[PDB]
C-alpha cells in the first residue's frame, strides 16, 4: 500500500508512463537542476512523517554525464534517498525490482536493522561472477 | 635496366645505352637465355641487394625486403592481385634522391625493366586472392 508521486521530468519519465500532502514515496527523476530544486524540497517538505525517496537514473542519482554549471551533482544532496537505481534511462523491470526491493525496508525496522548491510553487489556477486559465455552480438 | 634482342644493334655508349632505357655500367653484359624464369632471376637480384644494404636509410633498409617477399610469393605462386602494383610503387619511390645513396636506385633498376618486359611472367604468379587478415567472431568486418 504505497502512494507514489512521479517528479519524473524529460527522459526519464518516458521509461515510467510505461511502467499533495497524500503519498509516502517520492520517485525522483530525471535531471535535477539549481533552478527548480526548491520545488522539489518543498514537496519533499510538503509530504507526512514516513517518507521514502527513489532516486532512479545518473542523473538522479549523482549529476551523471552533466557535471556542469546548471547541474546539481545528485539528488541526495538536499533530500535524504532511500533506493538508488542506475541507468540512463533505467527500466520498469528496474522501477519493479525496486518497490521490491523497498518493501524489504518496510519491513525492516534506524531501519538498517544490521540486515541492510548485505548489499546486492554481494549478494548477486556468486550469481554474476560464475557466467562465462554471451550471445555474440552480430544477431539478433 | 634489362634489355631485350631489339635493343643489340646498338653501340655500347653511356648515352646510347642511356637512350635505350638502362645504364651501361661496368660493360660487362650479362646474357639471359629462354629456360631461365624471369621472376626467379629477379627474386636471385633483389635478394642481393636486400641483404647488402647498409641500413641506414629507411626505403632501402626497409623498402627492398618487402619486394624480396612478394618476389618469393610470386615464385612459389603464392602472390596476391595487389602485389605487381606495390612492386611498381616500390621502384618509383626508391628512385634517385629519395634514398640517401644510389645502391637503392641501382636496386631497382634490374626490377622495372622485368615487368616492363616481362608482365606475363610476374602475372603467372598471381594465383591466390587478397587476404592479410583473419576473422573474428562477433565482429562483423567492414566489407570495402
Ligand atoms: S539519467 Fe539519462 S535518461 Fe534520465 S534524465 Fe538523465 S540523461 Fe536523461
Ligand atoms: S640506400 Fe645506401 S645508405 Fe640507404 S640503406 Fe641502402 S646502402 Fe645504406
Redesign the pocket.
Same mark, same amino acid.
Given at each position: 500500500s504505497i502512494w507514489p508521486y512521479n517528479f519524473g521530468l524529460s527522459c526519464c519519465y518516458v521509461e515510467m508512463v510505461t511502467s499533495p500532502r497524500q503519498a509516502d514515496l517520492m520517485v525522483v527523476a530525471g535531471t535535477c537542476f539549481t533552478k527548480m530544486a526548491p520545488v522539489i524540497q518543498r514537496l519533499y517538505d510538503q509530504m507526512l512523517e514516513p517518507k521514502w525517496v527513489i532516486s532512479m537514473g545518473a542523473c538522479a542519482n549523482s549529476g551523471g554525464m552533466y557535471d556542469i554549471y546548471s547541474v546539481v551533482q545528485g539528488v541526495d544532496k538536499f533530500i535524504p534517498v532511500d533506493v538508488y537505481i542506475p541507468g540512463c534511462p533505467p527500466r520498469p523491470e528496474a522501477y519493479m525490482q525496486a518497490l521490491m526491493l523497498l518493501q524489504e525496508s518496510i519491513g525492516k525496522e534506524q531501519g538498517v536493522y544490521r540486515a541492510n548491510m548485505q548489499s546486492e553487489r554481494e549478494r548477486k556477486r556468486g550469481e554474476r561472477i560464475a557466467v562465462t559465455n554471451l550471445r555474440t552480438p552480430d544477431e539478433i | 635496366d634489362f634489355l631485350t634482342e631489339a635493343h643489340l644493334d646498338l653501340p655500347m655508349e653511356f648515352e646510347s645505352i642511356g637512350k635505350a632505357g638502362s645504364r651501361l655500367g661496368t660493360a660487362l653484359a650479362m646474357a639471359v637465355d629462354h629456360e631461365i624464369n624471369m621472376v626467379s632471376l629477379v627474386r636471385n637480384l633483389e635478394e642481393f641487394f636486400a641483404r647488402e644494404? #647498409?641500413?641506414?636509410?629507411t626505403? #632501402?633498409?626497409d623498402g627492398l625486403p618487402w619486394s624480396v617477399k612478394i618476389l618469393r610469393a610470386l615464385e612459389r605462386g603464392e602472390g596476391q592481385p595487389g602485389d605487381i602494383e606495390t612492386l611498381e610503387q616500390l621502384c618509383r619511390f626508391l628512385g634517385p634522391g629519395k634514398?640517401?645513396? &644510389?645502391? &637503392?636506385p641501382g636496386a631497382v633498376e634490374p626490377l622495372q625493366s622485368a615487368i616492363k618486359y616481362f608482365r606475363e611472367e610476374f602475372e603467372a604468379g598471381i594465383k591466390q586472392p587478397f587476404s592479410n587478415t583473419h576473422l573474428i567472431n562477433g565482429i562483423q568486418p567492414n566489407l570495402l
Open positions: - | 644494404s #647498409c641500413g641506414w636509410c626505403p #632501402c633498409r634514398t640517401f645513396c &644510389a645502391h &637503392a
